[PDB]
Every structure is written in C-alpha cells, then in structure tokens.
Amino acid sequence: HHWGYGKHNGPEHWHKDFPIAKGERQSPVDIDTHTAKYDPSLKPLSVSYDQATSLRILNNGHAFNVEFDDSQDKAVLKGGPLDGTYRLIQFHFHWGSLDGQGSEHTVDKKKYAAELHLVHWNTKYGDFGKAVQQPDGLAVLGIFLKVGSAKPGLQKVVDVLDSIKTKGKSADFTNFDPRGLLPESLDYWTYPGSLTTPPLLECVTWIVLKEPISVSSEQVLKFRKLNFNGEGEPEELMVDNWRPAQPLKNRQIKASFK
Ligand SMILES: [Zn+2]
C-alpha cells in the first residue's frame, strides 16, 4: 499496495508501517562534497559486467526493474569499500516530473533529473532474501542522470517501456549490457545506508558515482509516460518516484578520489 509516492502514501507516511524509516542509517542522503573525506584505505572498485545475463523488465508499480540471472557468479561488484563479492540482481531508476528533480541522493543539495540503482547482494549469504537480513547484505551502485545528450546504451530500455506501461506488465529483456549505462569515471562516494523504498532495510553499502551520465530529454520523457497504476485503472503517471534525503546521523561519507 500500500505504500507509494503520492501525497497520501508517499515517503512522509512510510514510517507508520515501516518504523525503520526514522532509523539511524536511512538512505538517500545529501552528499556534502566539502565534508566527505578522501579515504586512502579504499581498494580499487571492480565492476565486472562482461558476462551479465539480463532476463526480463518488469513494471512493479513503483519503477521498472531490469532483472538479471543471478544463479551464478556472472556480473559482480567487488573492491572499494566492499569485503567480498556482490552479485548483480537488478537495476532500476528513480526520476522526476521535471528535469530539476528526480534523484534520491543529492550533491551539495543539487537534485539530478534521475538516478540509476544497480543492486547487488553479498554472495557469502547465499541468496538475496538472506542478504537483506545482514548489515552488509547489499551494495547499490548509484549513478546520476542529467538531461543533455542521449545515452545510446539506454535506448533499448526506452524503447521497451511501451510494452510495460502499467503495473504488473513484464517483457523479455535478454542480452542487455548494463555497461552501456556507466559514465567514464568510477570516482565515487560511499556510506552505509538502506533501501530507499519500503521495507527501508538497513543493509546497503552505497557507492554513488560522482560523474553523472547524460540522457536526452526525449529519453526521460518516455520514462514519464509509464504508469503507477494497473491496466484498466485510472492513469497515474509514474513520475517523482524518489525519496528525499534523510538525516545523516552518525555517518561519514568517504570519497574514492583526491
Ligand atoms: Zn532505487
């Protein structure tokens, strides 16, 4: 259902069914770039997506997920702040009704037009459902989107959205290469946080890339034609599916770069 992003069931209401909403390590946060400190203990970040196997794209009524075959060690994230191997399971975005909002993390209070989350689970816990009962169960790689030139590796996503307009629709989505969504630089910030949607579980190591990708206005306009509702229900455009920044509390954001 029953949480959402509207006035009546959005982020300011989530705490009534998910009290960890007001916890000590909630996400997203504002990244104050002058306060974040370079951490020379960070080991090199390793994004290894060459054997990623995408399977399906799903409109889940909040966003769309591109799902991956995670039954073997294919597409993994390692290094950086992480101890161990984290396996890619899905990615999705958060975006706005207007270009001036849509990201979840902010940078010196700047909001980007959208934010990509590549979600990974720590293989030492055997499955995703076990990983989300652990303080180091997940790693989410976050990438900001700004509007300008088109991102050629996003267009295959854009062009399937027509087929998954409403909640509960899915389509085949094999052979998609998530490397085509990355920026050039892997400079990042990292901190310990949470899922940004209910159940808001505090299991995530966040790794947020500093360099945004550029997407075109036409690409993000097609994101904004999706629907939160099911087929045959009144149309509610899937826009503004982001949680605002949460209190930093007793956390430090570390930078990978000088
Ligand atoms: Zn997300």
Side-chain angles (χ1 to χ4, degrees), residues 2-258:
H2 305 74
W3 65 268
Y5 288 103
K7 39 236 149 311
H8 296 288
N9 61 0
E12 297 256 335
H13 299 269
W14 293 351
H15 72 99
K16 297 179 268 178
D17 289 274
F18 299 99
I20 196 171
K22 296 174 183 313
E24 297 302 303
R25 70 165 270 197
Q26 290 291 294
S27 293
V29 299
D30 182 57
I31 301 167
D32 189 280
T33 64
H34 290 112
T35 300
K37 193 186 186 189
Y38 168 66
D39 186 347
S41 83
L42 289 164
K43 270 87 159 223
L45 189 70
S46 171
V47 182
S48 303
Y49 287 170
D50 187 64
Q51 293 286 287
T53 294
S54 63
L55 291 177
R56 186 172 78 138
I57 189 171
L58 174 66
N59 175 335
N60 63 12
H62 307 295
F64 62 85
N65 294 344
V66 168
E67 300 162 351
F68 288 80
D69 166 26
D70 69 351
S71 68
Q72 269 173 305
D73 263 320
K74 343 221 192 207
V76 305
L77 183 65
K78 303 182 170 125
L82 304 173
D83 279 354
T85 293
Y86 292 65
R87 191 175 290 181
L88 178 63
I89 181 163
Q90 54 105 325
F91 67 75
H92 61 272
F93 304 78
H94 307 257
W95 60 93
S97 52
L98 303 168
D99 301 338
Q101 61 202 66
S103 68
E104 301 210 295
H105 295 89
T106 56
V107 178
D108 297 330
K109 298 291 177 86
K110 178 182 174 78
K111 301 170 159 83
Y112 287 91
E115 188 173 326
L116 165 60
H117 289 161
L118 292 127
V119 180
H120 312 72
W121 56 274
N122 190 332
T123 61
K124 81 190 261 243
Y125 302 121
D127 63 74
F128 178 96
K130 273 52 162 233
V132 306
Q133 302 176 50
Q134 313 309 320
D136 58 352
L138 296 183
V140 183
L141 177 64
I143 303 178
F144 296 120
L145 280 62
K146 63 179 175 168
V147 170
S149 306
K151 185 76 166 173
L154 183 61
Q155 190 61 35
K156 281 199 287 184
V157 176
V158 169
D159 283 326
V160 77
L161 296 183
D162 288 336
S163 69
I164 57 154
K165 183 182 172 59
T166 51
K167 186 181 44 193
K169 292 311 286 178
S170 58
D172 194 87
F173 202 68
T174 55
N175 298 293
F176 180 84
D177 186 357
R179 296 176 295 183
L181 299 179
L182 302 178
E184 284 178 4
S185 178
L186 293 180
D187 285 349
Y188 64 88
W189 294 285
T190 182
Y191 75 99
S194 74
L195 307 179
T196 69
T197 58
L200 299 174
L201 300 172
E202 288 185 341
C203 316
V204 183
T205 302
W206 278 95
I207 299 169
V208 177
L209 300 190
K210 174 168 175 198
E211 184 183 341
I213 63 163
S214 291
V215 304
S216 66
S217 183
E218 296 82 0
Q219 289 178 319
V220 65
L221 278 172
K222 291 175 177 186
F223 287 17
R224 298 181 187 132
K225 291 182 37 273
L226 288 162
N227 291 180
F228 286 127
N229 55 282
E231 185 185 6
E233 303 170 355
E235 188 171 50
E236 299 170 68
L237 295 176
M238 185 177 279
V239 293
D240 293 316
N241 55 357
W242 50 280
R243 190 192 196 191
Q246 302 298 308
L248 189 63
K249 298 188 173 269
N250 186 41
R251 296 181 282 183
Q252 293 194 304
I253 305 180
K254 297 290 197 210
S256 75
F257 60 89
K258 305 191 338 89

